[PDB]
């Protein structure tokens, strides 16, 4: 919900945030970070091009507060890439966190906890070259942070440890996930993915007759606009 | 003003930046990093490219001291994005200043304290992670973090509200500026943008003309460079 | 040696990472980060492409426990940025260390150094928009940082002065180092070096050559490779 996050994961360059800035106002700028639309690129790490940001222009040209709700991308399917970043990445994880719903909670969990652990090393290099001076003080803070990377490094181990056995049991259930992604990357096929859960199945009918089928690309963004895994206005094709 | 401000604003990729390192000497490296134009690129966030880089190398081997005064980029204004980035967006800026000196200082002021409250943020997710093998010494954080960001919240709200206020007559005084911007965004011409301010009128002219008179290009060089809004050796064309 | 560093020097983008994330093991996965090769990448700026993650792909593949050291780039000498990220560069920081052993060492603890200022500067700016309510506490807060940042300053200004004298040898021992270089980005060619140090002899004359003689890539690659100045796996060509 904030530039510097954008900014950070490299979602939006400086140049485009200062376009944005100065083209939306104060409040149709934060309605755009909080945007479903472009928190589902921002979890993505799916960058912002030009058309992009023309189309968050244009859609803003109006005072209507449910602007964002135009927003949405393009996909062609029939590249791996956007088959990869728009459809089996975002699948794959909602179909995880079905076996177990507290992975999710797991995997963010961490990441809260290695930012964490690089601010603790950070604030004993700190402490560390400070022992210099007051010397008595700086051991102080040292034994108190010292604790706390201690159990910090415990929570990790731990965390690491219930995804080990989920992710085990999740290979179980869906052993050619792999070979499949393979073959993607080669024939550009989905055939090396079967046997495919069974949850998964109304997804990958349609999935695999793009070419064929007319109405499947309907059927495909249905299916993951019902999951939660694309948007009202988001559209999918095939070359 | 390091490195490192370029490095975060991806104005100088890890790369580029290494190269420069190995062939620029500190103190040649300091004084390109605080020059006038390597501070215009990281203001309008123009990353460098292999051509910029080769310059740098190329003026700084002068030795003269003032080597830094020879940088300046060649732009086709044909290309919408470089009109917007090196027009556009600066001239706005500056016209905006015209309305009211203190809006510039505003806006960094934001940036300035959307930073400070980042940093408590950042300084609140720590001290929780330590609420609980810390209890006790954690209250007086918390404490002290509470008003400081609820301080820093009330003047953003402040500062929010004397900029929500110039936009308005900002608004008033150019009312084609989001029409002309979305005009050129997808159609490539400036059309959409008047009737323009009459203070802009002498940069206006020669502007919608570029490709038509030969002086129409230096004459929009001018007036950006009497404002500051380029660099002597800032060079611009039409080219389409 | 962790993602965070790879991320944040921009060897990886975030949507790269999310894939490999996903598609490698806890295990597997932070071996890539820890080999060699990757380290290469990190230590120069050589961010990843399209190509580099289907290869850190397939050789995920192989499932043994060595896999990352059949990792290694294909590069075209012909290409002067490659010319300079793959050879020049490398070469040099390898040459002035012959000149003198302390010279790396010197050139990676100003950047810690420099990481550092920079830390205690934020932490000024801080503790000075804290002052606005505690001008006693801020005061003595202020008072620590600004020692270190003394501290600090003067040991950057220990180690350029070093840096300084170093540079007025390695100067005079390849007195057309710069002009070289200049020539490389101008021209494209290699003949602005041309008086070169003893020591690259065997290096230059293949290097000179690498479109006439097929074998003249292969002998760059065992020259840079005997001195390990790049991977076993490295392979140059010259298109």
Redesign the interface.
């Known amino acids: 919900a904030?530039?510097?996050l954008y900014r950070e994961?490299?979602?939006i360059?400086?140049?485009?945030?200062?376009?944005l800035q100065?083209?939306l106002?104060?409040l149709r700028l934060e309605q755009l970070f909080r945007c479903e639309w472009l928190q589902q690129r921002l979890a993505?790490?799916?960058?912002l091009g030009?058309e992009e940001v023309?189309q968050i222009?244009?859609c803003a040209?109006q005072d209507d507060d449910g602007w964002c709700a135009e927003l949405g991308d393009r996909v062609n399917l029939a590249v791996p890439?956007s088959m990869?970043?728009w459809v089996l990445?975002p699948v794959?994880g909602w179909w995880e966190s079905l076996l177990d719903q507290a992975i999710p909670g797991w995997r963010l969990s961490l990441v809260?906890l290695?930012?964490?652990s690089?601010?603790l090393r950070?604030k004993s290099?700190?402490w560390s070259?400070?022992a210099?001076?007051?010397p008595e003080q700086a051991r102080e803070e040292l034994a108190?942070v010292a604790?706390?990377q201690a159990?910090?490094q415990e929570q990790v181990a731990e965390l690491?440890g219930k995804?080990?056995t989920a992710?085990a049991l999740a290979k179980s259930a869906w052993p050619n996930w792999?070979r499949g992604?393979?073959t993607l990357?080669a024939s550009g096929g989905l055939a090396g993915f079967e046997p495919i859960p069974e949850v998964l199945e109304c997804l990958w009918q349609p999935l695999c007759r793009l070419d064929d089928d007319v109405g499947a690309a309907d059927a495909v963004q249905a299916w993951l606009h019902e999951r939660n895994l694309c948007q009202a206005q988001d559209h999918f094709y095939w070359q």
């Not at 360059?13 to 376009?19: E, K, M, P």
């Not at 993505?44 to 960058?47: F, Q, S």
């Open positions: 904030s530039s510097s994961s490299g979602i360059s400086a140049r485009q945030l200062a376009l100065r083209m106002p104060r993505r790490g799916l960058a030009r023309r222009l244009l040209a890439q990869i970043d990445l794959y809260e290695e930012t964490q690089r601010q950070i290099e700190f070259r400070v210099e001076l007051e108190r604790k706390c159990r910090t690491a995804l080990e992710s792999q992604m393979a990357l």
